Protein backbone atom coordinates (compact mmCIF):
# COMPACT_ATOMS: atom_id res chain seq x y z
CA UNK A 1 0.00 0.00 0.00
CA UNK A 2 1.04 3.62 -0.59
CA UNK A 3 -0.53 7.01 0.11
CA UNK A 4 0.53 9.47 -2.64
CA UNK A 5 -0.67 13.07 -2.71
CA UNK A 6 -0.59 15.60 -5.55
CA UNK A 7 0.13 19.27 -4.94
CA UNK A 8 0.41 22.46 -6.95
CA UNK A 9 -1.04 25.86 -7.68
CA UNK A 10 -3.71 26.60 -10.29
CA UNK A 11 -2.07 26.50 -13.73
CA UNK A 12 0.22 23.57 -12.84
CA UNK A 13 -2.01 21.19 -14.85
CA UNK A 14 -2.35 19.07 -11.64
CA UNK A 15 -5.83 17.68 -12.18
CA UNK A 16 -5.14 16.81 -15.87
CA UNK A 17 -1.83 15.14 -14.77
CA UNK A 18 -3.34 13.05 -11.90
CA UNK A 19 -6.17 11.86 -14.25
CA UNK A 20 -3.66 10.63 -16.87
CA UNK A 21 -1.21 9.13 -14.36
CA UNK A 22 -4.11 7.30 -12.63
CA UNK A 23 -5.36 5.89 -15.97
CA UNK A 24 -1.86 4.47 -16.63
CA UNK A 25 -1.36 3.18 -13.07
CA UNK A 26 -4.72 1.25 -13.03
CA UNK A 27 -3.10 -1.09 -15.65
CA UNK A 28 -0.43 -2.40 -13.19
CA UNK A 29 -1.63 -1.54 -9.65
CA UNK A 30 -4.67 -1.83 -7.38
CA UNK A 31 -5.13 1.97 -7.17
CA UNK A 32 -7.91 4.49 -6.45
CA UNK A 33 -7.90 8.29 -7.06
CA UNK A 34 -9.82 10.69 -4.82
CA UNK A 35 -9.93 14.23 -3.49
CA UNK A 36 -11.64 15.90 -0.56
CA UNK A 37 -14.55 15.84 0.29
CA UNK A 38 -14.88 13.03 -2.31
CA UNK A 39 -18.50 12.17 -1.59
CA UNK A 40 -18.23 11.62 2.21
CA UNK A 41 -21.53 13.21 3.44
CA UNK A 42 -20.16 15.25 6.33
CA UNK A 43 -17.28 16.48 4.17
CA UNK A 44 -19.83 17.38 1.43
CA UNK A 45 -21.91 19.39 4.00
CA UNK A 46 -18.66 21.13 5.17
CA UNK A 47 -17.79 21.93 1.50
CA UNK A 48 -21.18 23.65 1.16
CA UNK A 49 -20.43 25.85 4.20
CA UNK A 50 -17.04 26.86 2.68
CA UNK A 51 -18.58 27.72 -0.74
CA UNK A 52 -21.41 29.71 0.96
CA UNK A 53 -18.77 31.63 3.01
CA UNK A 54 -15.84 36.87 3.81
CA UNK A 55 -15.20 33.82 6.01
CA UNK A 56 -12.58 34.13 8.79
CA UNK A 57 -9.47 32.35 7.50
CA UNK A 58 -9.07 30.23 10.69
CA UNK A 59 -12.71 28.99 10.43
CA UNK A 60 -12.02 28.21 6.76
CA UNK A 61 -8.79 26.31 7.71
CA UNK A 62 -10.70 24.29 10.37
CA UNK A 63 -13.43 23.39 7.83
CA UNK A 64 -10.81 22.15 5.34
CA UNK A 65 -9.16 20.08 8.12
CA UNK A 66 -12.60 18.62 9.25
CA UNK A 67 -13.35 17.62 5.63
CA UNK A 68 -9.80 16.16 5.41
CA UNK A 69 -10.40 13.99 8.50
CA UNK A 70 -13.84 12.67 7.25
CA UNK A 71 -12.35 11.86 3.80
CA UNK A 72 -9.29 10.22 5.50
CA UNK A 73 -11.42 8.01 7.83
CA UNK A 74 -14.05 6.90 5.33
CA UNK A 75 -12.07 6.67 2.10
CA UNK A 76 -8.28 6.77 2.50
CA UNK A 77 -7.58 4.59 5.59
CA UNK A 78 -9.97 1.73 4.49
CA UNK A 79 -8.37 1.66 1.00
CA UNK A 80 -4.79 1.56 2.48
CA UNK A 81 -5.94 -1.26 4.85
CA UNK A 82 -7.06 -3.24 1.72
CA UNK A 83 -3.48 -2.82 0.38
CA UNK A 84 -4.36 -0.20 -2.28
CA UNK A 85 -2.29 2.64 -3.72
CA UNK A 86 -4.27 5.82 -2.87
CA UNK A 87 -3.76 8.86 -5.12
CA UNK A 88 -5.16 12.04 -3.48
CA UNK A 89 -5.55 15.34 -5.34
CA UNK A 90 -4.55 17.92 -2.62
CA UNK A 91 -4.03 17.15 1.07
CA UNK A 92 -2.23 18.79 4.07
CA UNK A 93 0.17 20.80 1.83
CA UNK A 94 -2.75 22.65 0.15
CA UNK A 95 -3.84 23.89 3.61
CA UNK A 96 -0.20 24.80 4.45
CA UNK A 97 0.30 26.79 1.19
CA UNK A 98 -3.16 28.40 0.90
CA UNK A 99 -4.43 28.93 4.47
CA UNK A 100 -0.99 29.01 6.12
CA UNK A 101 1.24 30.85 3.70
CA UNK A 102 -0.84 32.77 1.09
CA UNK A 103 -3.59 33.80 3.55
CA UNK A 104 -1.03 34.51 6.29
CA UNK A 105 -2.16 32.36 9.26
CA UNK A 106 1.31 30.85 9.27
CA UNK A 107 2.46 27.45 7.96
CA UNK A 108 3.32 26.24 11.50
CA UNK A 109 -0.09 27.10 12.94
CA UNK A 110 -1.92 25.38 10.05
CA UNK A 111 0.41 22.36 10.34
CA UNK A 112 -0.57 21.98 14.07
CA UNK A 113 -4.25 22.07 13.09
CA UNK A 114 -3.74 19.54 10.31
CA UNK A 115 -1.70 17.22 12.51
CA UNK A 116 -4.81 17.04 14.81
CA UNK A 117 -6.86 16.11 11.71
CA UNK A 118 -4.51 13.51 10.19
CA UNK A 119 -3.25 11.97 13.44
CA UNK A 120 0.10 10.79 11.99
CA UNK A 121 -1.18 9.94 8.47
CA UNK A 122 1.29 11.94 6.38
CA UNK A 123 1.62 10.94 2.67
CA UNK A 124 4.31 8.35 1.80
CA UNK A 125 5.12 10.54 -1.21
CA UNK A 126 3.89 13.96 -2.40
CA UNK A 127 4.23 14.93 -6.06
CA UNK A 128 4.70 18.65 -6.36
CA UNK A 129 3.78 20.03 -9.81
CA UNK A 130 6.48 22.70 -10.00
CA UNK A 131 5.11 25.32 -12.38
CA UNK A 132 6.82 28.73 -12.58
CA UNK A 133 4.66 31.75 -11.72
CA UNK A 134 5.01 32.93 -15.38
CA UNK A 135 3.93 29.63 -17.05
CA UNK A 136 1.15 29.32 -14.42
CA UNK A 137 -0.09 32.88 -15.19
CA UNK A 138 -0.19 32.08 -18.98
CA UNK A 139 -2.15 28.80 -18.46
CA UNK A 140 -4.84 30.72 -16.49
CA UNK A 141 -6.08 41.01 -12.09
CA UNK A 142 -3.25 42.18 -9.76
CA UNK A 143 -4.83 40.58 -6.60
CA UNK A 144 -5.36 37.15 -8.30
CA UNK A 145 -1.74 37.26 -9.63
CA UNK A 146 -0.36 38.30 -6.19
CA UNK A 147 -2.24 35.36 -4.53
CA UNK A 148 -1.03 32.86 -7.23
CA UNK A 149 2.64 33.95 -6.69
CA UNK A 150 2.20 33.71 -2.85
CA UNK A 151 0.75 30.13 -3.20
CA UNK A 152 3.87 29.19 -5.25
CA UNK A 153 6.11 30.91 -2.68
CA UNK A 154 4.38 28.92 0.10
CA UNK A 155 4.85 25.57 -1.63
CA UNK A 156 8.58 26.40 -2.10
CA UNK A 157 8.93 27.19 1.66
CA UNK A 158 7.16 23.89 2.55
CA UNK A 159 9.24 21.77 0.13
CA UNK A 160 12.50 23.42 1.37
CA UNK A 161 11.68 22.22 4.93
CA UNK A 162 10.50 18.69 4.01
CA UNK A 163 12.58 17.69 0.93
CA UNK A 164 12.48 13.91 1.58
CA UNK A 165 8.64 13.57 1.42
CA UNK A 166 8.36 15.54 -1.84
CA UNK A 167 9.21 14.81 -5.42
CA UNK A 168 9.22 18.00 -7.46
CA UNK A 169 8.21 17.48 -11.11
CA UNK A 170 8.91 20.16 -13.75
CA UNK A 171 5.40 21.37 -14.60
CA UNK A 172 6.68 24.05 -17.10
CA UNK A 173 7.09 21.23 -19.69
CA UNK A 174 4.37 20.16 -22.14
CA UNK A 175 1.66 18.23 -20.33
CA UNK A 176 2.61 14.88 -22.00
CA UNK A 177 6.12 15.21 -20.42
CA UNK A 178 4.71 16.25 -17.00
CA UNK A 179 2.50 13.08 -17.12
CA UNK A 180 5.51 10.93 -18.06
CA UNK A 181 7.84 12.29 -15.32
CA UNK A 182 5.13 12.00 -12.63
CA UNK A 183 4.24 8.44 -13.72
CA UNK A 184 7.96 7.44 -13.74
CA UNK A 185 8.54 9.04 -10.28
CA UNK A 186 5.56 7.08 -8.90
CA UNK A 187 6.46 3.69 -10.42
CA UNK A 188 10.09 4.11 -9.18
CA UNK A 189 8.67 4.66 -5.66
CA UNK A 190 6.09 1.78 -5.90
CA UNK A 191 8.74 -0.72 -7.18
CA UNK A 192 11.07 0.07 -4.19
CA UNK A 193 8.35 -0.80 -1.58
CA UNK B 1 -15.45 45.27 28.59
CA UNK B 2 -15.09 41.74 30.00
CA UNK B 3 -15.25 38.25 28.55
CA UNK B 4 -16.48 35.82 31.26
CA UNK B 5 -17.05 32.16 30.55
CA UNK B 6 -18.98 29.64 32.65
CA UNK B 7 -17.92 26.03 32.88
CA UNK B 8 -19.09 22.91 34.62
CA UNK B 9 -20.72 19.51 34.10
CA UNK B 10 -24.46 19.02 33.74
CA UNK B 11 -26.24 19.42 37.11
CA UNK B 12 -23.85 22.25 38.22
CA UNK B 13 -26.73 24.80 38.18
CA UNK B 14 -25.00 26.59 35.25
CA UNK B 15 -28.24 27.72 33.49
CA UNK B 16 -29.74 29.16 36.71
CA UNK B 17 -26.41 30.81 37.63
CA UNK B 18 -25.83 32.59 34.28
CA UNK B 19 -29.45 33.84 34.08
CA UNK B 20 -29.51 35.14 37.70
CA UNK B 21 -26.03 36.75 37.39
CA UNK B 22 -27.20 38.38 34.09
CA UNK B 23 -30.29 39.85 35.81
CA UNK B 24 -28.13 41.37 38.59
CA UNK B 25 -25.22 42.62 36.40
CA UNK B 26 -27.57 44.40 33.84
CA UNK B 27 -28.34 47.04 36.54
CA UNK B 28 -24.75 48.37 36.29
CA UNK B 29 -23.29 46.95 33.01
CA UNK B 30 -24.16 46.51 29.33
CA UNK B 31 -24.30 42.74 29.53
CA UNK B 32 -25.18 39.95 27.11
CA UNK B 33 -25.71 36.22 27.61
CA UNK B 34 -24.46 33.91 24.84
CA UNK B 35 -23.49 30.32 24.07
CA UNK B 36 -22.02 28.81 20.95
CA UNK B 37 -23.05 28.87 18.13
CA UNK B 38 -25.25 31.74 19.40
CA UNK B 39 -27.16 32.48 16.19
CA UNK B 40 -24.09 33.08 13.99
CA UNK B 41 -25.22 31.61 10.57
CA UNK B 42 -22.07 29.53 9.85
CA UNK B 43 -21.95 28.28 13.47
CA UNK B 44 -25.64 27.30 13.29
CA UNK B 45 -24.93 25.30 10.06
CA UNK B 46 -21.98 23.57 11.78
CA UNK B 47 -24.28 22.79 14.77
CA UNK B 48 -26.84 21.17 12.34
CA UNK B 49 -24.06 18.89 10.99
CA UNK B 50 -23.18 17.89 14.60
CA UNK B 51 -26.87 17.29 15.57
CA UNK B 52 -28.22 15.87 12.27
CA UNK B 53 -25.37 13.38 11.77
CA UNK B 54 -19.28 11.04 13.75
CA UNK B 55 -15.47 10.63 14.19
CA UNK B 56 -14.53 12.36 17.53
CA UNK B 57 -11.78 14.52 15.91
CA UNK B 58 -14.13 15.76 13.19
CA UNK B 59 -16.59 16.54 16.04
CA UNK B 60 -13.87 18.40 18.02
CA UNK B 61 -12.90 20.47 14.90
CA UNK B 62 -16.57 21.38 14.30
CA UNK B 63 -16.99 22.62 17.91
CA UNK B 64 -13.77 24.62 17.37
CA UNK B 65 -15.00 26.06 14.05
CA UNK B 66 -18.35 27.07 15.63
CA UNK B 67 -16.30 28.56 18.53
CA UNK B 68 -14.23 30.74 16.12
CA UNK B 69 -17.32 32.00 14.24
CA UNK B 70 -19.11 32.84 17.51
CA UNK B 71 -15.95 34.63 18.76
CA UNK B 72 -15.34 36.67 15.57
CA UNK B 73 -18.94 37.52 14.71
CA UNK B 74 -20.54 37.88 18.17
CA UNK B 75 -18.11 38.02 21.16
CA UNK B 76 -15.46 40.45 19.72
CA UNK B 77 -18.07 42.93 18.31
CA UNK B 78 -19.78 42.93 21.81
CA UNK B 79 -16.45 43.46 23.62
CA UNK B 80 -15.74 46.40 21.23
CA UNK B 81 -19.07 48.00 22.31
CA UNK B 82 -17.91 47.83 25.99
CA UNK B 83 -20.12 44.87 26.90
CA UNK B 84 -19.70 42.28 29.63
CA UNK B 85 -20.06 39.02 27.72
CA UNK B 86 -21.38 36.07 29.78
CA UNK B 87 -20.52 32.99 27.71
CA UNK B 88 -21.97 29.52 28.52
CA UNK B 89 -19.13 27.07 27.73
CA UNK B 90 -15.91 27.82 25.84
CA UNK B 91 -12.39 26.28 25.41
CA UNK B 92 -12.56 24.38 28.74
CA UNK B 93 -15.69 22.40 27.72
CA UNK B 94 -13.80 21.12 24.60
CA UNK B 95 -10.84 20.14 26.86
CA UNK B 96 -13.04 18.34 29.46
CA UNK B 97 -15.50 16.73 26.98
CA UNK B 98 -13.52 16.04 23.75
CA UNK B 99 -10.07 15.99 25.32
CA UNK B 100 -10.60 14.09 28.57
CA UNK B 101 -13.97 12.30 28.67
CA UNK B 102 -14.02 11.27 24.95
CA UNK B 103 -10.32 10.30 25.10
CA UNK B 104 -8.75 12.34 22.26
CA UNK B 105 -6.29 13.81 24.78
CA UNK B 106 -6.41 17.18 26.55
CA UNK B 107 -3.10 18.38 24.96
CA UNK B 108 -4.27 17.57 21.38
CA UNK B 109 -7.63 19.37 22.00
CA UNK B 110 -5.83 22.35 23.66
CA UNK B 111 -3.67 22.83 20.51
CA UNK B 112 -6.84 22.67 18.33
CA UNK B 113 -8.56 25.29 20.48
CA UNK B 114 -5.60 27.63 20.67
CA UNK B 115 -5.70 27.66 16.83
CA UNK B 116 -9.44 28.53 17.11
CA UNK B 117 -9.23 31.28 19.73
CA UNK B 118 -5.89 32.75 18.63
CA UNK B 119 -5.04 34.20 22.09
CA UNK B 120 -8.57 35.23 23.05
CA UNK B 121 -8.71 33.59 26.44
CA UNK B 122 -11.57 34.55 28.83
CA UNK B 123 -10.80 37.47 31.20
CA UNK B 124 -12.49 35.36 33.92
CA UNK B 125 -13.85 31.79 34.00
CA UNK B 126 -16.38 30.66 36.64
CA UNK B 127 -16.08 26.93 37.26
CA UNK B 128 -19.25 25.60 38.91
CA UNK B 129 -17.58 22.92 41.03
CA UNK B 130 -20.28 20.37 41.76
CA UNK B 131 -19.65 16.86 43.07
CA UNK B 132 -20.76 14.03 40.75
CA UNK B 133 -23.43 13.06 43.37
CA UNK B 134 -25.07 16.49 43.76
CA UNK B 135 -24.83 16.97 39.95
CA UNK B 136 -26.62 13.61 39.34
CA UNK B 137 -29.51 14.69 41.64
CA UNK B 138 -29.88 18.04 39.79
CA UNK B 139 -29.90 16.18 36.43
CA UNK B 140 -32.79 13.89 37.68
CA UNK B 141 -27.75 5.01 33.17
CA UNK B 142 -24.29 3.55 34.06
CA UNK B 143 -22.57 4.83 30.86
CA UNK B 144 -24.03 8.35 31.44
CA UNK B 145 -22.98 8.37 35.14
CA UNK B 146 -19.41 7.33 34.24
CA UNK B 147 -19.29 9.94 31.43
CA UNK B 148 -20.50 12.64 33.93
CA UNK B 149 -17.74 11.53 36.34
CA UNK B 150 -15.08 11.64 33.53
CA UNK B 151 -16.20 15.19 32.57
CA UNK B 152 -15.68 16.23 36.24
CA UNK B 153 -12.25 14.52 36.29
CA UNK B 154 -11.45 16.38 33.05
CA UNK B 155 -12.28 19.71 34.66
CA UNK B 156 -10.17 18.82 37.74
CA UNK B 157 -7.11 18.33 35.43
CA UNK B 158 -7.66 21.71 33.66
CA UNK B 159 -7.99 23.59 37.02
CA UNK B 160 -4.82 21.76 38.38
CA UNK B 161 -5.40 32.60 37.10
CA UNK B 162 -8.61 33.30 35.08
CA UNK B 163 -10.25 30.34 36.91
CA UNK B 164 -12.55 30.97 39.83
CA UNK B 165 -13.96 27.78 41.35
CA UNK B 166 -17.37 28.27 43.00
CA UNK B 167 -18.75 25.59 45.34
CA UNK B 168 -21.77 24.35 43.34
CA UNK B 169 -22.84 21.78 46.02
CA UNK B 170 -24.44 24.67 47.94
CA UNK B 171 -28.15 25.55 47.34
CA UNK B 172 -28.43 27.53 44.06
CA UNK B 173 -29.15 30.85 45.92
CA UNK B 174 -25.64 30.62 47.43
CA UNK B 175 -24.04 29.44 44.17
CA UNK B 176 -25.58 32.59 42.50
CA UNK B 177 -24.37 34.91 45.31
CA UNK B 178 -20.79 33.54 45.29
CA UNK B 179 -20.61 33.72 41.47
CA UNK B 180 -21.98 37.31 41.41
CA UNK B 181 -19.59 38.47 44.16
CA UNK B 182 -16.63 36.85 42.29
CA UNK B 183 -17.63 38.65 39.07
CA UNK B 184 -18.14 42.04 40.83
CA UNK B 185 -14.71 41.80 42.53
CA UNK B 186 -13.19 41.16 39.07
CA UNK B 187 -15.10 43.94 37.22
CA UNK B 188 -14.49 46.55 39.96
CA UNK B 189 -10.70 45.86 40.04
C1 LIG C 1 -7.85 20.93 -0.06
C2 LIG C 1 -7.64 22.41 -0.06
C3 LIG C 1 -7.90 23.17 -1.13
N1 LIG C 1 -7.71 24.54 -1.13
C4 LIG C 1 -8.00 25.33 -2.31
C5 LIG C 1 -7.43 24.75 -3.60
C6 LIG C 1 -7.78 25.64 -4.79
C7 LIG C 1 -9.28 25.92 -4.85
N2 LIG C 1 -9.76 26.53 -3.61
C8 LIG C 1 -11.18 26.97 -3.62
C9 LIG C 1 -11.56 27.80 -2.37
C10 LIG C 1 -12.61 28.91 -2.40
C11 LIG C 1 -12.59 29.55 -1.03
C12 LIG C 1 -14.01 28.39 -2.60
C13 LIG C 1 -12.33 29.99 -3.41
C14 LIG C 1 -12.17 25.86 -3.90
C15 LIG C 1 -12.45 25.51 -5.22
C16 LIG C 1 -13.31 24.46 -5.51
C17 LIG C 1 -13.93 23.79 -4.47
C18 LIG C 1 -14.85 22.68 -4.74
O1 LIG C 1 -14.76 21.58 -4.21
O2 LIG C 1 -15.78 23.05 -5.64
C19 LIG C 1 -13.67 24.14 -3.16
O3 LIG C 1 -14.32 23.51 -2.12
C20 LIG C 1 -13.65 22.62 -1.31
C21 LIG C 1 -12.60 21.83 -1.76
C22 LIG C 1 -12.03 20.93 -0.87
C23 LIG C 1 -12.48 20.85 0.43
C24 LIG C 1 -13.53 21.65 0.84
BR1 LIG C 1 -14.14 21.59 2.64
C25 LIG C 1 -14.13 22.54 -0.01
C26 LIG C 1 -12.79 25.16 -2.88
C27 LIG C 1 -9.48 25.64 -2.45
C28 LIG C 1 -7.33 25.21 0.02
O4 LIG C 1 -7.26 26.43 0.08
N3 LIG C 1 -7.01 24.42 1.10
C29 LIG C 1 -7.15 23.04 1.16
O5 LIG C 1 -6.88 22.43 2.20
C1 LIG D 1 -19.11 23.99 23.72
C2 LIG D 1 -18.97 22.52 23.90
C3 LIG D 1 -19.95 21.73 24.39
N1 LIG D 1 -19.80 20.37 24.55
C4 LIG D 1 -20.86 19.57 25.11
C5 LIG D 1 -21.51 20.11 26.39
C6 LIG D 1 -22.68 19.24 26.86
C7 LIG D 1 -23.63 18.95 25.70
N2 LIG D 1 -22.90 18.30 24.60
C8 LIG D 1 -23.77 17.81 23.50
C9 LIG D 1 -23.00 16.95 22.48
C10 LIG D 1 -23.73 15.78 21.80
C11 LIG D 1 -22.71 15.01 20.99
C12 LIG D 1 -24.79 16.22 20.82
C13 LIG D 1 -24.33 14.80 22.79
C14 LIG D 1 -24.65 18.84 22.84
C15 LIG D 1 -25.90 19.08 23.40
C16 LIG D 1 -26.73 20.04 22.87
C17 LIG D 1 -26.35 20.74 21.74
C18 LIG D 1 -27.32 21.71 21.21
O1 LIG D 1 -26.77 22.94 21.15
O2 LIG D 1 -28.48 21.43 20.95
C19 LIG D 1 -25.12 20.48 21.15
O3 LIG D 1 -24.79 21.13 19.99
C20 LIG D 1 -23.74 22.02 19.95
C21 LIG D 1 -23.40 22.84 21.02
C22 LIG D 1 -22.35 23.73 20.88
C23 LIG D 1 -21.66 23.80 19.68
C24 LIG D 1 -22.03 22.99 18.63
BR1 LIG D 1 -21.11 23.02 16.98
C25 LIG D 1 -23.07 22.10 18.74
C26 LIG D 1 -24.28 19.54 21.70
C27 LIG D 1 -21.90 19.23 24.08
C28 LIG D 1 -18.67 19.71 24.13
O4 LIG D 1 -18.55 18.49 24.16
N3 LIG D 1 -17.66 20.52 23.69
C29 LIG D 1 -17.72 21.89 23.51
O5 LIG D 1 -16.75 22.50 23.05
From Swiss-Prot, chain B:
It is an enzyme of class 2 (transferase). CDD domains: TMPK. GO terms for molecular function: ATP binding; dTMP kinase activity. ATP binds at residues 8-15. Keywords: ATP-binding, Kinase, Nucleotide biosynthesis, Nucleotide-binding, Transferase. The keyword Chloroplast does not apply. GO terms for cellular component: cytosol. Its EC number is 2.7.4.9. Gene3D superfamilies: P-loop containing nucleotide triphosphate hydrolases (3.40.50.300). It catalyses: dTMP + ATP = dTDP + ADP. GO terms for biological process: dTDP biosynthetic process; dTTP biosynthetic process; dUDP biosynthetic process. PROSITE patterns: THYMIDYLATE_KINASE. Phosphorylation of dTMP to form dTDP in both de novo and salvage pathways of dTTP synthesis. Belongs to the thymidylate kinase family. NCBIfam families: DTMP_kinase. This is Thymidylate kinase. It comes from Staphylococcus aureus (strain N315).
Amino acid sequence: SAFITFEGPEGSGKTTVINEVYHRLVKDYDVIMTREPGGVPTGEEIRKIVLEGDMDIRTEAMLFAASRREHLVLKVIPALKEGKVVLCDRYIDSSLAYQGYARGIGVEEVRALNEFAINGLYPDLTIYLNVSAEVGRERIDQEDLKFHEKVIEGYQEIIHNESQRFKSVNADQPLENVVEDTYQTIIKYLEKI
